């Protein structure tokens, strides 16, 4: 890349798109009468700062 | 409040006693100012990174 402007990463139009959707993902449909996965509370991405 | 309908003879009957307008000493640079000006930094620091995306795009999409 010939410019600092652009970010370091940056979906480049020299690479060529991707395709469209798919997605296979069959899980059970729950009966929703309950409550659900929760993280704690200090609980963050790895690197968030 | 002018815009690209607003005409200079307007401009130059309501705008013309400020002696901000007399600091331009030529009328046909007014005339231009006004032309131009026809026709908030951060944000600036995104546009300059758009405008490098779409220069890069023009160049990649010609090749």
Redesign the interface.
Same mark, same amino acid.
């Given at each position: 890349?010939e410019?600092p !402007? +652009? @970010?370091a990463f940056?979906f !480049? @139009? +020299?690479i060529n798109p991707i395709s469209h959707r798919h997605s296979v993902k069959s899980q059970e449909p729950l009966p929703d009468d309950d409550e659900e996965f929760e993280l704690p509370e200090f609980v963050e991405p790895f690197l968030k700062d | 409040h002018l815009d690209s309908q607003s005409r200079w003879s307007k401009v130059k009957d309501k705008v013309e006693s400020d002696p901000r307008y007399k600091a331009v000493d030529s009328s046909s640079m007014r005339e231009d100012l006004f032309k131009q000006y026809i026709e908030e930094k951060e944000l600036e620091r995104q546009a300059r990174i758009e405008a490098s995306l779409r220069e890069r795009e023009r160049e990649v999409q010609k090749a």
């Open positions: 890349t410019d !402007d +652009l @970010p940056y !480049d @139009p +020299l | -």
